[PDB]
């Protein structure tokens, strides 16, 4: 049934779901499953043993939290099936999976088994008419309104730079590292433990994520701010008590720009971007430096753009125009692109029809994904 297709930006930390043609993702919620930690004792307690969406956030302290996917790869598939069912529930999208094509998204350079199982879940558990699994850089470029650019997407679980010139993707310049917002939040939890505040529960880890979102920033340069030893700032916990953050405010998001702070022998986000640009052809490099597009929630850190510009200037050639485009809707750029793409009449030629899946199976989605 050729109703409006359903666009599901399948983030590692937050899922953004809506119908194609909508200006913004109407149904966004965290990508985790909460289960009641304690014992149900009273008649008339909360119904159901699986809490997903704002119901999980309202009763966050009551629940033990599990994230179905890590680094863009689904680890628990029953939880992912539950969450994608919740996307279709009476609360979210109030619709039937059978009647709407689906535009899914995944990180680049992901395992093939992930795509295979996602297609299997969306064609067998849900009897979707049509599925299309799309990479996210193209959606960032659609949302920002370009055809040329290098998309540096840093989300909850995966950071990656994808260069595209005139709508042609360079698949061999795609850089990816598994350092993203969740790693920064874990590092911030470690630093807070080193202050004296132990946040070992999972709801307390969500509190740490809120701390990272609210009170954390990237200094323009690390050495002078590290040596200054500035004063501490007060953050109010949910229960009313206060904590002194201090150096954890800025030493935590520095994990993006040097993953060796946790022993990972990986590249910084600036090195990811510059390597993606410099692996491209020699003539496209100057154009790619002038068109850098930020995406994902981890690029929203206070002072992120300034530090990234300074680092890319340090790494780029002399007198090269670097211009980083950082739209306001960095969180929802991927979904807005998916909505723009799914609304096109050309989108009918891209998806994998259900009968086409039955004919081939994993081969159909493997061919038509790229």
């Amino acid at each position: 049934i050729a109703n409006q297709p359903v666009v599901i930006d399948n983030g590692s930390g937050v899922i953004k779901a809506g119908f194609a043609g909508d200006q913004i993702p109407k149904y966004c919620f965290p990508n985790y499953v909460g289960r009641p930690k304690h014992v149900r004792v009273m008649a008339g307690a909360l119904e159901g043993d699986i809490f997903i969406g704002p119901k999980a956030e309202e009763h966050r302290g009551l629940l033990s939290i599990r994230y179905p996917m890590e680094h863009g790869i689904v680890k628990d598939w029953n939880d992912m099936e539950r969450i994608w069912q919740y996307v279709y529930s009476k609360d979210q999208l109030q619709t039937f999976s059978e009647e709407h094509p689906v535009l899914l998204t995944e990180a680049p350079l992901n395992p093939r088994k992930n795509r295979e199982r996602a297609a299997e879940v969306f064609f067998e558990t849900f009897n979707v008419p049509a599925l299309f699994i799309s990479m996210q850089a193209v959606l960032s470029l659609y949302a920002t309104g370009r055809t040329t650019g290098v998309v540096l997407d840093s989300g909850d679980g995966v950071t990656h730079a994808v260069p595209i010139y005139e709508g042609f993707a360079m698949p061999h310049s795609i850089m990816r590292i598994d350092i993203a917002g969740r790693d920064v939040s874990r590092f911030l939890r470690l630093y807070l433990r080193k202050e004296g505040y132990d946040f070992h529960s999972s709801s307390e880890f969500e509190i740490v994520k809120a701390i990272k979102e609210r009170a954390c920033y990237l200094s323009i340069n690390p050495q002078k701010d590290e040596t200054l030893e500035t004063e501490k700032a007060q953050y109010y916990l949910p229960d009313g008590s206060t904590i002194e953050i201090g150096p954890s405010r800025f030493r935590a998001p520095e994990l993006l720009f040097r993953p060796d702070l946790i022993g990972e022998e990986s590249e910084g986000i600036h090195e990811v971007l510059v390597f993606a640009i410099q692996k491209s052809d020699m003539d496209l490099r100057r154009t790619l430096f002038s068109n850098i597009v930020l995406s994902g929630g981890s690029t929203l850190f206070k002072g992120f753009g300034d530090r990234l510009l300074s680092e890319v200037k340090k790494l780029a050639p002399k007198d090269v125009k670097i211009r980083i485009s950082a739209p306001q809707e960095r969180l929802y750029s991927t979904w807005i692109g998916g909505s723009i793409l799914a609304s096109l009449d050309t989108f009918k030629k891209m998806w994998v029809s259900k009968k086409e899946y039955e004919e081939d199976g994993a081969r159909s989605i493997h061919r038509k994904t790229f």
Binding site: Y142, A143, G145, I336, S339, I340, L344, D345, T346
Partner: protein, 141 residues
């Protein structure tokens, strides 16, 4: 011609200003769909590619021919013009269907001329002259 008219309208200041205003409002749905989903570029490419074959087709000479030698010469001209298909990217199956249609027109024209001839009424030698002319036309085909 219609696609050229649509293209000329698309380049007018009003359409460009509308698209620029929608871009400045970040309403990229409409602008991207207008750029891509129209199919105007592909249609223009196809008709411009087909134009050399369609331009100045001599089919009228076959349709206006009232004598068998004129029909033969019109067929020569039509096939010499159909030899221009190499320059284009016309579908070959569509070319064979066009040849089918040209054969239909040739049959209709021959039927008209022979109806004006009244073959059975005239003497036998005139009938033989008309027959050899018609079979020369078929051999030319």
């Amino acid at each position: 011609r219609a696609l050229y008219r649509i293209q000329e309208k698309r380049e007018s200041p009003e359409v460009l200003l509308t698209l620029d205003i929608l871009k400045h409002g970040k309403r990229f749905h409409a602008t991207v769909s207008f750029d891509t989903d129209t199919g105007l570029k592909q249609a223009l490419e196809t008709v411009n590619d087909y134009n050399p074959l369609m331009k100045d087709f001599p089919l009228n000479d076959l349709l206006s021919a009232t004598e068998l030698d004129k029909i033969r010469q019109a067929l020569v001209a039509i096939f010499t013009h159909l030899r221009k298909i190499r320059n284009t990217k016309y579908p070959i199956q569509r070319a064979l269907r066009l040849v089918e249609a040209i054969s239909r027109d040739l049959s209709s024209q021959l039927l008209k001329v022979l109806g004006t001839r009244k073959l059975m009424h005239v003497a036998y030698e005139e009938f033989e002259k008309v027959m050899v002319a018609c079979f020369e036309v078929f051999q030319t085909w």
